[PDB]
Design an enzyme around this catalytic site. Structure first.
Site, PDB file in Angstrom:
ATOM      1  N   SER A  63       0.862  -1.194   0.000  1.00 52.61           N
ATOM      2  CA  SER A  63       0.000   0.000   0.000  1.00 52.61           C
ATOM      3  C   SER A  63       0.893   1.237   0.000  1.00 52.61           C
ATOM      4  CB  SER A  63      -0.992  -0.109   1.171  1.00 52.61           C
ATOM      5  OG  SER A  63      -2.184   0.644   0.924  1.00 52.61           O
ATOM      6  N   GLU A  69      -8.887  -6.232  -3.855  1.00 53.28           N
ATOM      7  CA  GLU A  69      -8.308  -5.045  -3.215  1.00 53.28           C
ATOM      8  C   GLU A  69      -9.382  -4.077  -2.695  1.00 53.28           C
ATOM      9  OE1 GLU A  69      -5.334  -4.459  -2.513  1.00 53.28           O
ATOM     10  OE2 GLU A  69      -3.972  -5.460  -3.938  1.00 53.28           O
ATOM     11  N   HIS A  82      -7.388  -6.687   0.380  1.00 49.30           N
ATOM     12  CA  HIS A  82      -6.237  -5.817   0.538  1.00 49.30           C
ATOM     13  C   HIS A  82      -5.568  -6.038   1.889  1.00 49.30           C
ATOM     14  CE1 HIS A  82      -3.807  -2.182   0.213  1.00 49.30           C
ATOM     15  NE2 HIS A  82      -4.217  -1.860   1.429  1.00 49.30           N
TER      16      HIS A  82
HETATM   17  C1  LIG Z   1      -2.428   1.813   1.616  1.00 46.28           C
HETATM   18  O1  LIG Z   1      -1.732   2.278   2.509  1.00 46.28           O
HETATM   19  N1  LIG Z   1      -3.704   2.317   1.352  1.00 46.28           N
HETATM   20  C2  LIG Z   1      -4.429   1.640   0.279  1.00 46.28           C
HETATM   21  C3  LIG Z   1      -4.377   3.337   2.089  1.00 46.28           C
HETATM   22  C4  LIG Z   1      -4.757   4.594   1.574  1.00 46.28           C
HETATM   23  C5  LIG Z   1      -5.462   5.499   2.416  1.00 46.28           C
HETATM   24  C6  LIG Z   1      -5.804   5.164   3.729  1.00 46.28           C
HETATM   25  C7  LIG Z   1      -5.461   3.905   4.289  1.00 46.28           C
HETATM   26  C8  LIG Z   1      -5.638   3.228   5.598  1.00 46.28           C
HETATM   27  C9  LIG Z   1      -6.321   3.647   6.890  1.00 46.28           C
HETATM   28  N2  LIG Z   1      -7.875   3.481   6.909  1.00 46.28           N
HETATM   29  C10 LIG Z   1      -8.480   4.611   6.060  1.00 46.28           C
HETATM   30  C11 LIG Z   1      -8.364   2.118   6.342  1.00 46.28           C
HETATM   31  C12 LIG Z   1      -8.112   0.914   7.275  1.00 46.28           C
HETATM   32  C13 LIG Z   1      -8.460  -0.493   6.669  1.00 46.28           C
HETATM   33  C14 LIG Z   1      -7.564  -0.842   5.456  1.00 46.28           C
HETATM   34  C15 LIG Z   1      -7.830  -2.159   4.727  1.00 46.28           C
HETATM   35  C16 LIG Z   1      -7.160  -3.372   5.364  1.00 46.28           C
HETATM   36  C17 LIG Z   1      -7.980  -3.930   6.550  1.00 46.28           C
HETATM   37  C18 LIG Z   1      -8.984  -2.946   7.138  1.00 46.28           C
HETATM   38  C19 LIG Z   1      -8.388  -1.659   7.671  1.00 46.28           C
HETATM   39  C20 LIG Z   1      -5.039   1.990   5.440  1.00 46.28           C
HETATM   40  N3  LIG Z   1      -4.512   1.846   4.175  1.00 46.28           N
HETATM   41  C21 LIG Z   1      -4.749   3.015   3.432  1.00 46.28           C
END
Ligand SMILES: *C(=O)N(C)c1cccc2c(CN(C)CCC3CCCCCC3)c[nH]c12
Ligand SMILES: *[C@@H]1O[C@H](CO[C@@H]2O[C@@H](C)[C@@H](O)[C@@H](O)[C@@H]2O)[C@@H](O[C@@H]2O[C@H](CO)[C@@H](O[C@@H]3O[C@H](CO)[C@@H](O)[C@H](O)[C@@H]3O)[C@H](O)[C@H]2NC(C)=O)[C@H](O)[C@H]1NC(C)=O
Ligand SMILES: *[C@@H]1O[C@H](CO[C@@H]2O[C@@H](C)[C@@H](O)[C@@H](O)[C@@H]2O)[C@@H](O[C@@H]2O[C@H](CO)[C@@H](O)[C@H](O)[C@H]2NC(C)=O)[C@H](O)[C@H]1NC(C)=O
Ligand SMILES: *[C@@H]1O[C@H](CO[C@@H]2O[C@@H](C)[C@@H](O)[C@@H](O)[C@@H]2O)[C@@H](O[C@@H]2O[C@H](CO)[C@@H](O)[C@H](O)[C@H]2NC(C)=O)[C@H](O)[C@H]1NC(C)=O
Ligand SMILES: *[C@@H]1O[C@H](CO[C@@H]2O[C@@H](C)[C@@H](O)[C@@H](O)[C@@H]2O)[C@@H](O)[C@H](O)[C@H]1NC(C)=O
Ligand SMILES: *[C@@H]1O[C@H](CO[C@@H]2O[C@@H](C)[C@@H](O)[C@@H](O)[C@@H]2O)[C@@H](O)[C@H](O)[C@H]1NC(C)=O
Ligand SMILES: CC(=O)N[C@H]1[C@H]([C@H](O)[C@H](O)CO)O[C@@](O)(C(=O)O)C[C@@H]1O
Ligand SMILES: *[C@@H]1O[C@H](CO)[C@@H](O)[C@H](O)[C@H]1NC(C)=O
Length: 526
Positions: A195, A322, A435
């Site tokens: 990511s 994803e 993802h």
């Molecule tokens: C990678 O770092 N990405 C895709 C990204 C972009 C923007 C915010 C992100 C976060 C934090 N919050 C918003 C989401 C948390 C989720 C992420 C999916 C995996 C399991 C559930 C937790 C995390 N990644 C991003």
């Protein structure tokens, strides 16, 4: 066991792993803590110490806002920081094989978290298995995130932007000067990340000041040309100014604004970070990489297109589903606690959430290309299309476009499509191969038999770990012994890729061809 580094001696600890031993050095500092006058500035070099630094526990994670969307749910909370938050957070970790290696290849992990969250001490980033099984050295570092790491008034060194990227770079530097003392080979360093970590790795390929600090690069579910990964210089200014307004720090002298923000308490800054955007999305990156004229000399689409990057091998890939994780963070009709069958109207509202500033015609065009079904009665039709929209736009098509462009300049590239859903996944089934859930396979957690993964998952992790390690050591992600499928290079003509799963590793061609021609050719015109 004790190691003398260029800045002073550090003490590690022995770890029992798989009937063997790994030496772990957890929480070695690699920069002056970026506090006081140093907040928002580039990381400063570390003053030598004369004692013995005790690197026997993970250090503070950098300041960041916690995901509270599902309190008590391990599926989201496993990503939250597991050490004290602190501005004093510029530390790194080293896992080395026991017995100490002679000249081991070094793997450097850069975590994701949207440049707003993350920490190196997460259980799924524990490098002790890689060091035990493949005799590589694993380095991971904490780097500043959010405003504290990416606030930008570009051209002004009190807040130039990209500080968290310079944190990473200074840790890469630390590995070059010190890793030979741990038995590592500074000439054999592979960056890997996922990511925003993968986006970070792709920007290190582009930054001249990183070119001498690594050999090869691995990009999991991310690249800088993903739509969430680079902040425009317009937004960076509008966002620095908004946060100034929220904090009562609006001034006229730009430097005076930063001085004001420097006296604010970290939690004040963090709490106002969220509302700096007008229209946020689940994938919003408030404070991210910018074109600063230092780390990034030009807009990275231009550098990529014109071949201005480190010539080396890359390994790039994405997961089958994803986009699905992000739908429960805002899309209406979605929920991890039901099967999230949404209507056409809910799908349309979902596009508004994920494409906030996009014209009406642009959202209709998304709908048109993703809603011509093989079966129109399939009640999951719209649920899966929205996941596919988010995943193709934000991950798959940018990864493929990066790999095409990068390989066009003569370099060997290897692309994977990860399609195994972890048997212990706590999220619901409709989200599929989510993802972030290849990471534990890459780090070899399923190799631990006590951890109730299936046998087929142990084997898949074993083969994945071998392929990653052979890529880092030899530039070639093969598993050459257990009659494995040969992983072909990704060429811009045939575009072959390898599928990673427990049943059959297949070679396929032209992943998501129809969808990515829409996203990468039509959609940027809207
Ligand atoms: C990678 O770092 N990405 C895709 C990204 C972009 C923007 C915010 C992100 C976060 C934090 N919050 C918003 C989401 C948390 C989720 C992420 C999916 C995996 C399991 C559930 C937790 C995390 N990644 C991003
Ligand atoms: C550890 O291994 C490295 C080699 O690492 C390998 O080569 C890299 C380019 C990457 O492809 C890695 O993935 C790969 O594993 C050894 O590096 C060697 O260093 C010495 C000096 O440090 C170099 O010596 C040269 O000698 C000539 C002639 O005398 C001089 O003219 C040169 O200026 C140069 O100093 C040697 O070229 C270099 N080897 C390679 C292949 O680049 C390193 O010595 C080794 N260390 C230990 C302790 O084993
Ligand atoms: C650029 O910035 C202005 C100002 O942002 C507002 O004030 C900040 C302190 C923060 O609290 C933001 O959330 C605010 O919205 C933006 O102007 C706003 O635009 C929205 C709609 O886009 C409107 O509803 C608000 O009333 C506007 N507020 C003000 C003070 O003008 C602007 O949208 C930002 N971005 C762009 C692209 O112009
Ligand atoms: C799936 O759940 C969503 C979310 O609703 C929440 O979670 C449920 C599991 C349940 O505990 C509810 O009490 C929660 O509110 C449902 O979406 C909601 O639907 C109502 C209409 O009944 C609507 O007024 C809300 O705005 C919706 N919330 C959101 C966030 O969209 C959805 O209907 C459920 N679908 C299925 C197939 O079960
Ligand atoms: C550094 O470590 C020294 C070695 O002792 C080891 O570490 C401590 C924390 C205990 O767990 C002990 O059982 C270990 O063998 C300590 O003697 C020393 O006090 C430590 N110094 C600092 C500054 O932490
Ligand atoms: C390779 O396989 C090992 C065990 O498999 C056994 O040995 C091979 C050579 C075949 O004879 C097979 O039929 C046997 O079952 C694993 O222990 C090892 O970890 C595997 N290595 C990799 C890199 O996947
Ligand atoms: C912010 C933070 O984590 N600070 C320090 C913590 C806490 O102050 C205490 O454990 C109380 O919570 O304690 C240490 O000194 C320790 O004993 O290893 C290490 C660390 O630097
Ligand atoms: C702002 O203040 C700094 C000193 O803090 C000074 O050097 C500078 O000239 C002032 N004005 C501008 C426009 O930066």
């Amino acid at each position: 066991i004790i190691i003398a580094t260029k800045n002073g001696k550090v003490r590690g600890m022995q770890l029992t792993v798989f009937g063997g031993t790994v030496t772990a050095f957890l929480g070695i500092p690699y920069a002056q803590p970026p506090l006081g006058r140093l907040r928002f500035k580039k990381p400063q070099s570390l003053t030598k110490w004369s004692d013995i630094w005790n690197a026997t526990k993970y250090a503070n994670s950098c300041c960041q806002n916690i995901d509270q969307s599902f309190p008590g749910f391990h599926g989201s909370e496993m990503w939250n920081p597991n050490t004290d938050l602190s501005e004093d957070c510029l530390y790194l970790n080293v896992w080395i094989p026991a017995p100490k290696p002679k000249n081991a290849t070094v793997l450097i992990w850069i975590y994701g978290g949207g440049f707003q969250t993350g920490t190196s001490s997460l259980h799924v980033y524990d490098g002790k298995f890689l060091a035990r099984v493949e005799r590589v050295i694993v380095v991971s570092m904490n780097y500043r995130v959010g405003a504290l790491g990416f606030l930008a008034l570009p051209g002004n060194p009190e807040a130039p932007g990209n500080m968290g990227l310079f944190d990473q770079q200074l840790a890469l530097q630390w590995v070059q000067k010190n890793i030979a003392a741990f038995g590592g080979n500074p000439k054999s360093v592979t960056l890997f990340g996922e990511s925003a970590g993968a986006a970070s790795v792709s920007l290190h390929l582009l930054s001249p000041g990183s070119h001498s600090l690594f050999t090869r690069a691995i990009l999991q579910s991310g690249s800088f040309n993903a739509p969430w990964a680079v902040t425009s210089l317009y937004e960076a200014r509008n966002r620095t100014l908004n946060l100034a307004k929220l904090t009562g720090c609006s001034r006229e002298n730009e430097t005076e604004i930063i001085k004001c923000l420097r006296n604010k308490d970290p939690q004040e800054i963090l709490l106002n970070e969220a509302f700096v955007v007008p229209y946020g999305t689940p994938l919003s990156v408030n404070f991210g990489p910018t074109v600063d004229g230092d780390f990034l000399t030009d807009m990275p689409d231009i550098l990529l297109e014109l071949g201005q990057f480190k010539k080396t091998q890359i390994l790039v890939g994405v997961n089958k589903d994803e986009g699905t994780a992000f739908l429960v963070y805002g899309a209406p009709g979605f929920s991890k606690d039901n099967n999230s069958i949404i209507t056409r109207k809910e799908f349309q509202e979902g596009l508004k959430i994920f494409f906030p500033g996009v014209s009406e015609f642009g959202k209709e065009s998304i709908l048109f290309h993703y809603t011509d079904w093989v079966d129109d009665q399939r009640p999951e039709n719209y649920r899966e299309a929205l996941g596919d929209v988010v995943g193709d736009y934000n991950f798959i098509c940018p990864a493929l476009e990066f790999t095409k462009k990068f390989s066009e300049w003569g370099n060997n590239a290897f692309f994977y499509y990860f399609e195994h859903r972890s048997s212990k996944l706590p999220w619901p089934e409709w989200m599929g191969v989510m993802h972030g859930y290849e990471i534990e396979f890459v780090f070899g957690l399923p190799l631990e038999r006590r951890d109730q993964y299936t046998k087929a998952e142990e084997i898949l992790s074993r083969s994945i770990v071998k392929r990653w390690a052979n890529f880092a050591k030899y530039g070639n992600p093969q598993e050459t012994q257990n009659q494995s499928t040969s992983w072909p290079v990704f060429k811009s003509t045939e575009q072959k890729y390898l599928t990673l799963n427990t049943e059959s590793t297949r070679i396929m061609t032209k992943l998501r061809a129809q969808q990515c021609r829409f996203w990468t050719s039509f959609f940027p015109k809207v």
